Amino acid sequence: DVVDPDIFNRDPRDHYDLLQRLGGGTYGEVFKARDKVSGDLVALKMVDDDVSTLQKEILILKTCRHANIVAYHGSYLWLQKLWICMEFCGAGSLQDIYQVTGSLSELQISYVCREVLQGLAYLHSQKKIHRDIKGANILINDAGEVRLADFGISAQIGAELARRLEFIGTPYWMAPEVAAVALKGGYNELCDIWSLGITAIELAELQPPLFDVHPLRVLFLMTKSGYQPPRLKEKGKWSAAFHNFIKVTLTKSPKKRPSATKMLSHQLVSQPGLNRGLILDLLDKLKNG
Amino acid sequence: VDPDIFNRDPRDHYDLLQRLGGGTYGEVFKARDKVSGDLVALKMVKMEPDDDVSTLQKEILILKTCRHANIVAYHGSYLWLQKLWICMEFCGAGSLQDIYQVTGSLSELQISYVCREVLQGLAYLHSQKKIHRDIKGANILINDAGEVRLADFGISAQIGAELARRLEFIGTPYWMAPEVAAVALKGGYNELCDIWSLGITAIELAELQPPLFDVHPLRVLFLMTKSGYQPPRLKEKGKWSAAFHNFIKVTLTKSPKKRPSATKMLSHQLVSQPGLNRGLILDLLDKLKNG
Numbered sequence: 131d132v133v134d135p136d137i138f139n140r141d142p143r144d145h146y147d148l149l150q151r152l153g154g155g156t157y158g159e160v161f162k163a164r165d166k167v168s169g170d171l172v173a174l175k176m177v178d179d180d181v182s183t184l185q186k187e188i189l190i191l192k193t194c195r196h197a198n199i200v201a202y203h204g205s206y207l208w209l210q211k212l213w214i215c216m217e218f219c220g221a222g223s224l225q226d227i228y229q230v231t232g233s234l235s236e237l238q239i240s241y242v243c244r245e246v247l248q249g250l251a252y253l254h255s256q257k258k259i260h261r262d263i264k265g266a267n268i269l270i271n272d273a274g275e276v277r278l279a280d281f282g283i284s285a286q287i288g289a290e291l292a293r294r295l296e297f298i299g300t301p302y303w304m305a306p307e308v309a310a311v312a313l314k315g316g317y318n319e320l321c322d323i324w325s326l327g328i329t330a331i332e333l334a335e336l337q338p339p340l341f342d343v344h345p346l347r348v349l350f351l352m353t354k355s356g357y358q359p360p361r362l363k364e365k366g367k368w369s370a371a372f373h374n375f376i377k378v379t380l381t382k383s384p385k386k387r388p389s390a391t392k393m394l395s396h397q398l399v400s401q402p403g404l405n406r407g408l409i410l411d412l413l414d415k416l417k418n419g
Numbered sequence: 420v421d422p423d424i425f426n427r428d429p430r431d432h433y434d435l436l437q438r439l440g441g442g443t444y445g446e447v448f449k450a451r452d453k454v455s456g457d458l459v460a461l462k463m464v465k466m467e468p469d470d471d472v473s474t475l476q477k478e479i480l481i482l483k484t485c486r487h488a489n490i491v492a493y494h495g496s497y498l499w500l501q502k503l504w505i506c507m508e509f510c511g512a513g514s515l516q517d518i519y520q521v522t523g524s525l526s527e528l529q530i531s532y533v534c535r536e537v538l539q540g541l542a543y544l545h546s547q548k549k550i551h552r553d554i555k556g557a558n559i560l561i562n563d564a565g566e567v568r569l570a571d572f573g574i575s576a577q578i579g580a581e582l583a584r585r586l587e588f589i590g591t592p593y594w595m596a597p598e599v600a601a602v603a604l605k606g607g608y609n610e611l612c613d614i615w616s617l618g619i620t621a622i623e624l625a626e627l628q629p630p631l632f633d634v635h636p637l638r639v640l641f642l643m644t645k646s647g648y649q650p651p652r653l654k655e656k657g658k659w660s661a662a663f664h665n666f667i668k669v670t671l672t673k674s675p676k677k678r679p680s681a682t683k684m685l686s687h688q689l690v691s692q693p694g695l696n697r698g699l700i701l702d703l704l705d706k707l708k709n710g
């Protein structure tokens with residue numbers, strides 16, 4: 131693969147002024163930027179590995195045109211950096227937000243869950259897996275819209291699915307669980323359903339479950355026999371519908387965990403009363419009081 | 420790779436004799452130590468430039484840090500003209516596959532002794548948090564004394580190198596589904612895959628073929644993944660005791676959740692039998708040189 135034809139071979143700063151760092155992890159920064167001619171605001175993401183495999187994130191975002199997935203504007207290849215130009219979501223991520231406003235209301239969490247689920251149903255119908263669903267990767271814009279973002283790890287999934295079936299060993303002596311991994315990989319899209327369940331707890335309690343425990347310990351625990359799916363800490367603050375939502379999304383067995391589409395029929399996210407005003411309230415609270 | 424690898428021609432230390440095998444990516448030679456006269460096996464591996472060396476490091480290192488009788492012994496390594504040479508213990512009878520392709524199917528007692536010795540090797544490995552991942556008759560070597568040695572940690576090395584490499588870049592785990600977490604730590608299975616392969620190997624030793632060997636490989640992969648695939652059984656019910664039938668049944672437990680560990684299997688009736696010794700394989704080797 132060579133760099134996608136639609137990518138711009140120029141310096142993004144020829145088109146945009148950089149105003150502020152919006153964050154980004156250890157390896158790449160996201161900038162609030164402004165179009166030098168239009169005056170329109172965008173977000174520029176500046177994303178060893180491989181150029182042709184790193185750009186998979188661009189392809190994913192570019193081929194997504196759904197109201198619950200962050201909108202793609204364009205991409206640049208300049209010197210030692212790949213840039214993604216996307217819609218600027220003014221309130222940033224849900225994590226950015228709740229770190230200021232505190233825990234979300236149940237109705238607000240319900241609304242986020244519904245919108246994430248719609249994004250996930252879209253993605254999964256295209257045989258895409260997000261693989262990194264969490265507060266920090268769900269963005270809110272000024273119109274109170276909920277947008278999935280950060281398809282870096284998703285790009286690793288998509289890259290494997292475009293390629294043929296390659297093997298390590300011989301099947302006849304393989305254990306059935308070795309066979310499954312070798313064939314289908316160790317997981318599928320239903321892993322996003324679990325992550326959403328954890329995200330809902332995160333929005334409710336400002337931390338994912340077991341956050342204070344060493345990561346490697348958590349990883350070892352999750353792989354033990356008899357791992358207990360997480361629950362909401364305070365049982366009284368939340369409705370039975372919410373407890374049930376958490377319960378089924380956090381179904382241990384991938385074969386019995388409900389799909390995004392099935393989850394969209396769950397009572398918690400089909401509540402009459404779920405509306406964008408819930409998010410506009412959050413944005414007001416973020417703004418002032 | 421190894422920090423004690425010899426960057427020199429192995430032929431400075433050994434005279435090469437016969438070819439003993441080799442899949443598609445190299446060869447194995449019987450060799451003689453020019454100083455001591457002792458006989459070894461030299462496994463040669465081709466190092467092509469798009470093959471990241473991390474795999475080959477892992478293999479030697481797995482072999483280097485194993486001290487157990489039922490694991491083929493490691494002596495040293497040579498890097499010469501982009502060829503990796505692994506010097507190891509010479510097992511003059513070759514592999515169980517090499518042997519049964521001449522002698523024919525093994526007796527139940529002979530299979531029991533092999534299983535015990537492998538389970539001793541596997542128990543040790545899993546106590547080193549290592550997985551062979553390639554247990555099969557071609558990878559079980561027999562020396563002239565009738566003793567059993569696990570070998571060929573090539574696949575183990577590959578999977579191992581991949582995992583250590585991916586571990587570094589797997590981020591925070593708190594939002595991961597257990598199945599995602601399982602993949603992160605270890606490719607989505609555990610050491611109990613070795614017990615399954617041994618069970619298959621016992622059937623292979625009994626019938627000269629693994630189950631479904633007449634079925635196309637990709638189809639077998641497919642069929643095994645499908646919910647409702649039923650574990651194999653020995654073809655003939657009457658050639659084998661109930662202890663053997665149960666050994667197969669219990670090692671070939673589909674769920675990696677209820678499949679017995681190595682050490683648990685060592686207490687199984689079939690391998691805890693008195694009368695299990697290298698004499699049983701010496702019998703097989705006798706059969707190999709006459710009738």
Ligand SMILES: Nc1ncnc2c1ncn2[C@@H]1O[C@H](COP(=O)(O)OP(=O)(O)NP(=O)(O)O)[C@@H](O)[C@H]1O
Pocket residue numbers: 152153154155156157158159160173175177200216217218219220222223226266267269279280282
């Ligand atoms: N389009 C956007 N509009 C507004 N804020 C954004 C936008 N994209 C990202 N951000 C913010 O900047 C962060 C960038 O994270 P992300 O897009 O996941 O890139 P990343 O390199 O993968 N960082 P990481 O979270 O470590 O994976 C997000 O968590 C938000 O806080």
Ligand SMILES: Nc1ncnc2c1ncn2[C@@H]1O[C@H](COP(=O)(O)OP(=O)(O)NP(=O)(O)O)[C@@H](O)[C@H]1O
Pocket residue numbers: 439440441442443444445447460462491507508509510511512513514517557558560570571573
């Ligand atoms: N130490 C040894 N002593 C005697 N014969 C050996 C020894 N090591 C290997 N052999 C023989 O040579 C073969 C070498 O193959 P092996 O080392 O198992 O894997 P490989 O051929 O290098 N790759 P693969 O195709 O996956 O088996 C064995 O099956 C034996 O027949």
Ligand SMILES: [Mg+2]
Pocket residue numbers: 266267280
């Ligand atoms: Mg992120």
Ligand SMILES: [Mg+2]
Pocket residue numbers: 262280281282283
């Ligand atoms: Mg990311």
Ligand SMILES: [Mg+2]
Pocket residue numbers: 557558571
């Ligand atoms: Mg082999």
